[PDB]
């Protein structure tokens, strides 16, 4: 949630590393893990969405550069 700028090397970090990296947690055997997943799945998605909006704004500005 603290990432305010996405590096050029991590533009696709969300769909291929962040989201796919925690996806296994949503089905963990430990109820505490699934609880942490359910408690944060909403936050993870919202954070990834903020990233996508920034990448789109940056791309729009870079196209207008």
């Amino acid at each position: 949630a603290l990432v305010k700028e996405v590096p050029r090397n991590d533009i696709n970090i969300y769909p291929e590393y962040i989201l796919p990296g925690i996806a296994h947690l949503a089905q963990d055997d430990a109820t505490i893990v699934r609880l942490a997943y359910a408690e944060n799945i909403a936050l993870l998605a919202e954070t990834a969405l903020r990233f996508l909006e920034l990448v789109q704004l940056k791309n729009l500005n870079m196209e207008n550069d």
Binding site: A30, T31, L35
Partner: protein, 127 residues
């Protein structure tokens, strides 16, 4: 004087069952406020403090560790109390034995009705 030559124990990481705590009865008197208090906030008259019998209170139990809640609070089902607040209800806590940290505490807050849709705490305890 009882006896027990052997102590049988299990590691909290080895008990794969939910931790259950039964909120039993609340014994003691809840003090009523002065009429000036009812004049300051007229909704107080409709509060559970003004029901003559033991109001139907419930306790929400949430486990905290290091100040962070481990799970959502669990509430006792509604039960009508006559002369004594006696829940006698086994609450299934949303925390498993292996998931409790060493500094885990259970916070139980007793709530009473405070007008339409608003609950006000009667009192709390943490163990």
């Amino acid at each position: 004087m009882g006896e027990a030559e052997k102590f049988h124990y299990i590691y909290s990481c080895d008990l794969d069952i939910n931790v259950q705590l039964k909120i039993g009865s609340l014994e003691g008197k809840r003090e009523q406020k002065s009429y000036k208090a009812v004049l300051e906030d007229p909704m107080l008259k409709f509060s559970g403090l003004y029901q003559e019998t033991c109001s139907d209170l419930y306790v929400t139990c949430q486990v905290f560790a290091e100040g962070k809640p481990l799970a959502l609070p669990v509430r006792t089902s509604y039960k009508a109390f006559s002369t004594r607040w006696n829940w006698n209800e086994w609450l299934k806590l949303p925390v498993k034995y292996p998931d409790l940290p060493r500094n885990a505490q259970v916070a139980l807050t007793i709530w009473d009705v405070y007008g339409p849709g608003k609950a006000v705490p009667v009192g709390g305890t943490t163990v």
